[PDB]
Amino acid sequence: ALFLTRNESKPFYFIQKFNDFFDWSTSVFSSGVAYILKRTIRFVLVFCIM
Secondary structure (H helix, E strand, O other), X not given: OOOOOOOOOXXXXXXXXXXXXXXXXXXXXXXXXXXXXXXHHHHHHHHHHO
């Protein structure tokens, strides 16, 4: 609350590339989560095999 600006400005160009990389990473993560939740039984068996 002391020093943290509400609006963060001037992001680094590599960080901005990192931000898009992390964004598509979380998109693929959400897709994988949806695929796993679609078929529970196989991943339960995967956990047992693990």
